[PDB]
Amino acid sequence: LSRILKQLPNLGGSDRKTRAMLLANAVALQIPFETLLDFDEQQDKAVAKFKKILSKVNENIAVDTKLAVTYFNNILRIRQSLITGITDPCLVKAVLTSDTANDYLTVDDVNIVSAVVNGPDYNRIQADMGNALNQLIGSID
Amino acid sequence: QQLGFELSRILKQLPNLGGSDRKTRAMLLANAVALQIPFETLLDFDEQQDKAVAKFKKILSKVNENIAVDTKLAVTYFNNILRIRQSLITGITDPCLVKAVLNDYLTVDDVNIVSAVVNGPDYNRIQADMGNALNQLIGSID
Amino acid sequence: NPIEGGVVQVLPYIAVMKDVYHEVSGVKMDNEEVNMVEAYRDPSILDDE
Amino acid sequence: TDEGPGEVVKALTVNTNIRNSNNAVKRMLNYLAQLREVVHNGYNRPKFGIIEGALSAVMRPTYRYKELDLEKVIDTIKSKDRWDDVCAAILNCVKAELFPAHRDSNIEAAFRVISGNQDETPMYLFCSDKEIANYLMTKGDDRTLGAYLKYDIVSTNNQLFDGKLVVIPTRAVQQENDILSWGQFFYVSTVIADLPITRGGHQVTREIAAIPFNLHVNNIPFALEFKITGFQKVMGETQFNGKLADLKP
Amino acid sequence: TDEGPGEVVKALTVNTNIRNSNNAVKRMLNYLAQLREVVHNGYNRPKFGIIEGALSAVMRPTYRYKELDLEKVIDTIKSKDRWDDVCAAILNCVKAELFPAHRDSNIEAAFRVISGNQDETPMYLFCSDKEIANYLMTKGDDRTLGAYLKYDIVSTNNQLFDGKLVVIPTRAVQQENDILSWGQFFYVSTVIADLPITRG
Amino acid sequence: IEGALSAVMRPTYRYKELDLEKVIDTIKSKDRWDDVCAAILNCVKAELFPAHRDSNIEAAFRVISGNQDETPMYLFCSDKEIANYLMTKGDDRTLGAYLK
Amino acid sequence: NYNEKSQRDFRVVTIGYNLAASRQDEFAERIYPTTVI
Amino acid sequence: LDHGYDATALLETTEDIITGELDDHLESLSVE
Amino acid sequence: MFLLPYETTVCKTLYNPTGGGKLYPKQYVDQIENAIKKANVYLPIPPVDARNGETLEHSGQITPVDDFEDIKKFTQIVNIGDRDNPKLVVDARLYKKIEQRTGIPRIIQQNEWQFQYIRMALNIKLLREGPDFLHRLGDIPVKVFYNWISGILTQKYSLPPESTQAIWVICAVYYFAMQDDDLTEPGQERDRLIPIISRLTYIPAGFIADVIDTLGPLHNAGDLAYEISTNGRSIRMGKLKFSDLQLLVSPSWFGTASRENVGVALEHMPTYITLIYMALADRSYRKTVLSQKVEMISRSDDASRFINLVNEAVSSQFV
Amino acid sequence: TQVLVMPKAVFESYKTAGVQFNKLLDTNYIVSETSVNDLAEIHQALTAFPFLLPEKLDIKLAVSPIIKVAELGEIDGPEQFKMKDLHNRLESRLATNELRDAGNRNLVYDYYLYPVDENLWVAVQQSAHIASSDPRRVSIQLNHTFFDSMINEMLNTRPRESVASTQIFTYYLESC
Amino acid sequence: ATIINTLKTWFEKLMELFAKLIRWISDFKKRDVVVATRYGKIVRAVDQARTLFQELLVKNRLGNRKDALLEKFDAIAQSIIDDPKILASRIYAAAFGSVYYQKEIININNEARTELGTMEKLVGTIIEYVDYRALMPIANIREIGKLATRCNELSTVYPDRSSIPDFPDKNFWKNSHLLKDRFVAPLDDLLKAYRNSSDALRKLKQLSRNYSQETIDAIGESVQLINTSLEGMRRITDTMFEYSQAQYLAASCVLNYYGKCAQVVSEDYKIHGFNDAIREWQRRFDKVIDDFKRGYA
Amino acid sequence: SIALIPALDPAGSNADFFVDPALVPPYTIKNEQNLTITTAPLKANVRLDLMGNSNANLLIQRGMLEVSDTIDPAGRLKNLFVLLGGKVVKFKVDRLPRAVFQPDLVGDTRNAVIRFDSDDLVVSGDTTFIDGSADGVINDLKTAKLSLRL
Amino acid sequence: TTKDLPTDPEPGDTYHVNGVDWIYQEDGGWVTMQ
DSSP, rough: HHHHHHTTTOOOOTTTHHHHHHHHHHHHHOOOOOOSTTTTHHHHHHHHHHHHHHHGGGGGGSSOOHHHHHHHHHHHHHHHHHHHHHOOHHHHHHHSTTHHHHHHOHHHHHHHHHHTTTTHHHTHHHHHHHHHHHHHHHGGO | OOHHHHHHHHHHTOOOTTTTHHHHHHHHHHHHHHSSSSOOTOOOOHHHHHHHHHHHHHHHHHHHTTTTOOOOHHHHHHHHHHHHHHHHHHHHHOHHHHHOOOOOOHHHHHHHHHOOOOOOOEEEEEEHHHHHHHHHHHHHHH | HHHHHHEEEOOOOOOEEEOOOOSOOOOOOOOOEGGGGGGTTTTTGGGOO | OOOOOOHHHHHHHHHHHHHHHHHHHHHHHHHHHHOOOOOOOTTOOOOOOSSSSSSTTSSSEEEEEEEEEGTTOOOOOOOOHHHHHHHHHHHHHHHHEEEEEEETTTHHHHHHHHHHTTTTOOOOEEEEEETTTTGGGSSOOBBBSSSOOOOEEEEEEEEGTEEEEEEEESSOOTTTTOTSSEEEEEOOOOOOEEEEETTTTOOOOOOEEEOOOOOEEEEHHHHHEEEEEHHHHHHSSSSSHHHHHHTTT | OOOSSSSTTTTHHHHHHHHHHHHHHHHHHHHHHHHHHHHTTTOOOOOOOSSOGGGGGGGGOOOOOOOOOGGGGGOOSSSHHHHHHHHHHHHHHHHHHHHHHHHHSSSHHHHHHOOOTOOOEEEEEEEEEEEHHHHHOOOTTBBSSSSOOEEEEEOOOOOOOOOOEEEEESSSSSSTOTTTTTTOOOEEOOOOOOOOOOOO | OOGGGGTOOOOOOOOOOOOGGTTTTOOOOGHHHHHHHHHHHHHHHHHHHHHHHHTTTHHHHHHHOOSSSSOOOOOOOTTHHHHSSSOOOOOOOOOOOSSO | OOOOOOOOOOOOEOHHHHHHHSSHHHHHHSSSEEEEO | OOSOOOHHHHSSSHHHHHHHHHHHHHHHHHOO | OSSSSGGHHHHHHHOTTTTTTSOOOOOHHHHHHHHHHHHHHHHHOOOOOOOTTTTBBEEEEESSSSSSSSSSSSSSSSEEEOOSSEEEEEGGGGGGEEESSOOOOESSSEEEEEHHHHHHHHHHHHHHHHGGGGGGOHHHHHHHHHHHHHHHHHHHTOHHHHHHHHHHHHHHHHHHHTTTTTSSSHHHHHHHHHHHHHHHHOOHHHHHHHHHHHOOOOOSHHHHHHHHHHSSSSSSSOOOHHHHHHHHGGGGOSSTHHHHHHHHHTTTTHHHHHHHHHHHHHHHTTTSSSHHHHHHHHHHHHHHHHHHHHHHHTTTTTT | EEEEEEHHHHHHHHHTTTGGGGGGHHHHHHHHHHHHHHHHHHHHHHTTTOOOOOHHHHHHOOOHHHHHHHHTTTSSSHHHHHHHHHHHHHHHHHHHHHHHGGGSSSSEEEEEEEEEEEEEEEEEEEEEEEEESSHHHHHHHHHHHHHHHHHHTTTSSSSSSHHTTTTHHHHHHOOO | HHHHHHHHHHHHHHHHHHHHHHHHHHHHHHHHHHHHHHHHHHHHHHHHHHHHHHHHHHTTTGGGHHHHHHHHHHHHHHHHTOOOSSSHHHHHHTTOOOEEEEEHHHHHHHHHHHHHHHHHHHHHHHHHHHHOOOOOOHHHHHHHHHHHHHHHHHHHOSSSSEEEEEEEETGGGGGGGGGGSOOOSHHHHHHHHHHHHHHHTTTTTTOOSSOHHHHHHHHHHHHHHHHHHHHHHHHHHHHHHHHHHHHHHHHHHHHHHHHHHHHHHHHHHHHHHOOHHHHHHHHHHHHHHHHHHHOOO | OOOBBBETTTOOOGGGGGTTTTTOOOOOEEEESSEEEEOOOOOOOOOTTTTTTHHHHHHOOOTTOOOOOOSSOOOBOOOOEEEEHHHHHHHTTTGGGGGBEEOSSSSSOOOOOOOOOOOOOEEEEEEOOTTSSOOOOOHHHTTTTOEEEE | OOOOOEEEEEEOOEEEEEEEEEETTTTTTTEEEE
16 A cells, blocks of 8 residues: 555645545546436445545555545546536547547547647537537437 | 538538548547437447447438548547547546546646656556555455 | 528628719719728729819 | 339439539639629629629629649759649749739728628638649648738549639638628529339339539639649659750750 | 618718828828929938928938839749748848938938937838738748848738838837828817708 | 459559659759659659549549548559658658548 | 429528728828827 | 618627627637 | 416417407317327326426426327417416427337427426426516516617617617516516506616616606507507607517527517516526527527626526426 | 457457558557557457467467567667557556456357458457356357357368367367 | 617626636636746756766767667657657647747747737726727737737647648757746736726726717727737737647656666666766766656655 | 520421521520420510420420429529621620519519619620621721720 | 747758757757757
């Protein structure tokens, strides 16, 4: 536990904040959200288990447990939006140009995503398609 | 306003260069639709992919009545973007997404830069060590 | 729409005309009307002495 | 034969789509001929009824025709610069003829007054075949002419553009049913019907037919037409040192 | 009708404003013709009454008319360089006549005396149509002549500039009622008046 | 002629003898490598673009493949003395506006 | 009325039209700067 | 028509154009 | 006050050709009402969905199924219940297509369906709880109304500022007349509106009081058209009837039954409020005349509050 | 030949995108046309391939791309350090997958054979089936059409008498 | 009258535009403070590391291994310059060493700092109204449009880097000296100008009085000019901010290049026979890395 | 093939609808088959059955046309033939805004009215007559450097 | 200060400013010698 925690470089006063993010991801990776339920029963169970896991932070070095819960709850809500579907260019950009997206895309595919996403008018065009689809996606049999 | 015409009208507004236009045109359709289509709760990924692609191809059939799109390339992009979306809902959520949606200021680049200079583990390797060093705890409890 | 079967383009503008009386012979009113837009390229259409 | 018309509709749909494309080419080139006659005659002021196009009443009709024989245009020294020398020769010819046409037509005033944006200018479209277009882009051009005008590039494989480049202005950002587009295509759903026609009173065959129902309209009475030839002679042969070799006694 | 036109009455102001611009062009071109005649004749020293202009009695009147046929001016070897070479050909010709005209005229001394600023020099304006401005506006990074003189480019679409480039000095920083401007526009508020005239 | 597509596109063949002593024109020797490479590539472009247009190959490919914007990708078939010259710098897989 | 093909109910579009001028043009203003009398 | 064939009413109002430009600019900020 | 769209002047005109005007289209609503009640016997009318998969209390929809064949394709919401617990039904066959594989209807246009069930949710709240929430939705609905109606009239008829101000006062009073039945007739209750209208329009009380003193009844859109022509200090409009207002407002929206929905909005409050909600909660409805007037006068902070207040009015009717 | 196991998701990408299947054994090509996750999943799919190939007939199981990348990162050249960076990304992504799909545990996959030349036997890893009791026998019965596909192809070059002695031939007989 | 409502509506819209921009620029300032603190540490480390290699190579202290190590160094640079995080836009091309693009970006920054004064004057003109028509600074408005236009051209990301001429290749560390002078966006000037503009308009809430048509026309032109100026400056600011971020990445990339190169020297002479100069050099380089790490910590 | 081309009866039965051949000789149009019809411009100031005298009847059989045959409202005035000094000049006006068929507002709903009013028909030195000549009025216009706007 | 270099120089040119030597390589443009 502490062996790997000591691998994180010290950065200002954020030592208690980056590890809070790392822990929130470490738990959220292995507690899935069952698509069958909505965001109340499966959400409360995932959060309850996370808070129970925080009971062992005495073995850790620098974990801000109040922020770690904040990060964990943000992960679940972000997953809810992704399940339902996202169009907001401010979040679509964040997904398309990300550490996960660079592992599923090839080098050439990323170069293309970086050409569209970083266009001077991307946010406007992406928003317009979001409405064009949100209003009419159901028309497609 | 048929969806094929509205999407085509919007795509016409992308800047043009030359033949590279079909790669960026296809990518944008893949991005918008792969992320916009809602997932059905009763399906697993295998079935959700088959259903989402069936609709995506039907959308291209309507778009290709107005603006030319390479069908095979657009599907290639669609499947890649859809898999990313599926991974995020079942898998690890990037901290840039928690940061983007939610006092969050110091970013990942900031620690990956230091790790690169000292030639040590980066954020993603540390994240992998975290979960691994946590595997036993989560599996043991419920 | 098939029911429409055509379009109409309506072009409003402000015309610069000439102060002209109607003559008795009156084949037509010799009123040199020009679109005000033309004044941007050839302002002489506005000259008035 | 008892079958659905599905494949037949696809065959007729493509045929109709080709006709619509060819009609646009014929309409464009025929309209240029209309500009040639009107601009040839004494019509240098906006007036209703001279030529089709809603903007002929606000801007001056303009038409310029130039022939480019590249063996008499290009100045080149090195082989590795030969591509850029060909590209620049064509673009510089367009600038030389387009700058006075952009000024003379008063197109900026028409666009600004119609759009309501006093800082808006047209963005030109370079319409050529699939050979000339390959020479109009030069990496560091930024699709930008002398001071501020921008251009786009499209190409056709139509025989009627075998060696033509035509420069026409359009609105930089296109709106639905926008008047400031150089032309406009008014499309109504194509009608396809299947009747067991007994044509002639003797033969019998079911005739599945597609009836196009659309119109191509021109709005802006402005074009520059270039005839560009000689690509193979200026690129496929030595130009500088070969001419020096011919000075030998 | 009580109040019919709301936007049409605005055309009365636009009509006035465009005419004011056109009057500036006629005054400029007619002044240049008058200056050409004075400088063409034996008037190379300050004098009163020969031409309009408060400074005509402190500086030598100067006018240089040059006809530039680019074929006889440009020299290039490549085609991708021709844009730069033709743009420089025009600017180099302006410098060729501008520097000796600046030296031969006394405008710099006149500015130094009139403004009271011993570090002030005139700034030249390149007055041209759209066709020529396209060539002069090579980049905003330059806008500088040889050592210390600067210039700016102002374009018009007026019909009377079919093929003219005219370079005129102004004060680098323009002030109210500043005599050192090449010219002045003396404006009095334009009155818009209404009355039911029973004309005829 | 042999070829399933001889009935969908026009047969096209262009033969050019690139005798470099009559094609290359340069002034400095340090540019000779680029001038030789460019002279070959530019001659190919000069004869390729009109063959692409006049052969109607793009239309044939689009109909058969079913894509409205698919074009052939051309192959430079040569020995190991000439293939060396083709710089291939980085990508530089581009013939012009739309072909690789 | 075997063929009632539309003749009258056309889609009509109003073309914009708005003129402006900033006192005398910037060309005239830079050459003849305005002084208010 | 939309409003009417009177050529005076067909003319777009300058004040409405200014408001429209303000609304379009603010809409873009909301999207971005 | 109008409770159901079919009580409004526009529906009376469209669905009651004989004696059209001030006469309820009984022969049309009762026919489609009976068809729904009879269909409920063999196949119960399913509830109306809303937001995140929730249903509306005392609601139903006619789904695109074979059983619902005797019901005519009506557009406006039909009440098949009583006054105390009315069950509102909307025809979904114009909005949803039946899926041939599973059998679940799918929405063709989301904003058109979203419009339908928000209007119903606000109408159910009105029918059951009364016109209480309509007075606390903010100053946007009233500012939009008189700017929207006066804006079209001012541009069309080249009206002077004085006539535009008179129309603002007339429309502002009419809007309130549709919220409180005591404001539909002349009297001291109309005068109580002067402080409010001045605050909204920034028009001096003297001008406002002079206009109100001359106003007659304001029970429907026909009365609105009359007062606009009568006490609007302009003769260029002529003598407007409700049929003239319908022609002025019809091009202010788009979609299924877009001309009826806007005309109904002139009298039916839940419909008008829903249109503004869609104008602020959508981007597709950005090119319309109504949406421009909503965004023109709506500030960012006030628009957010408006949406939140409507969302509570809608969600409070969820099962 | 050499069997290269890849998930259906990766195979369909190759076929849809149009990636030359011939050059998927050349590390320098597959890394350019393959995402980091796809490369990691190919490794995972190789390590989940239960069957022993007929080594006696020179039929080998492909070395996973991660190993090939790791080896090139230690060999002097102009791309060595870029290949080292790729290796690190593969290890982190592989560990991320292993921590997520560890729950898979007791199941077996259907495989589909897509022959590519004589030097590459693409084996597509398709739908999973749950198998806890005697998963070896369940895997054999499920992959009937995989076993006969392998037999059909190796009989094109190998002698029939030699193929008949392989475990792959036996598995076919055991299935049916 | 309706004029008062028209003026008040415009004023609210302008203040709302500033309110949105001020929040965005504050976020930029908060991020820039974090970046500026880290950027100082990076540049110091790069300057120290560059000196150490200059001494290492110029004295030929590597011996026969010089050539082999240099080849490895090139390989390191090639692996960094091709990092997908480095966009193909000219903004990043400038950040990574290109000179022509950097000069244009700097010139744009310097000009924006002066056009902001024009924006304040436009708002002040509205205060002077609420015939007195100001001559209006439409001039600088032409320039801000051109600057925003060029900013969009610079920030555009092409599908492939080959579309940018003279894009930085593996030799991006050779021009690291250009990173010494940190590029700073005019974020403080923007906040001052926007907050003063918003407050000035806030003080116009009470309008009163019927205005002449010539006053309303003059106000209308001022409002239109301000709207255009705000959109133009937004485009410029975003592009100038992007370069600040790009320069931070470029400085980090050069430092990573030097760090990895030092690691190869250490490993190469641990496998082979090390000299004393090599161990001394590495200890000096380790000190530079330690100071860098302590600065971040 | 769907064009409504006024056709001249070789027997002259409808010759009074067409311009005297002495001024504008007729010209021949063929369809994809070997069927050939003779076409001439219609005489100005004429009343006729426009469909009945079209090539549709004289192409195959005189009585093919029935009430099912209707005219497309989207028609245009294609050419005008103007007589000048005994010779005829052909003016192409097909695409002009005044050549478009308009609905007749008063009367049957299937009536189309053409109202072509143009002050800008150019006759100049570069003009030729229908037969290609440029003699007479045009020649004098050429040598005087004049043009007429008819 | 070290961006005072001539615009549009020839390939292979060398130019010295503020103790910094710049080669104008054809590919990378202006790059320091070392």
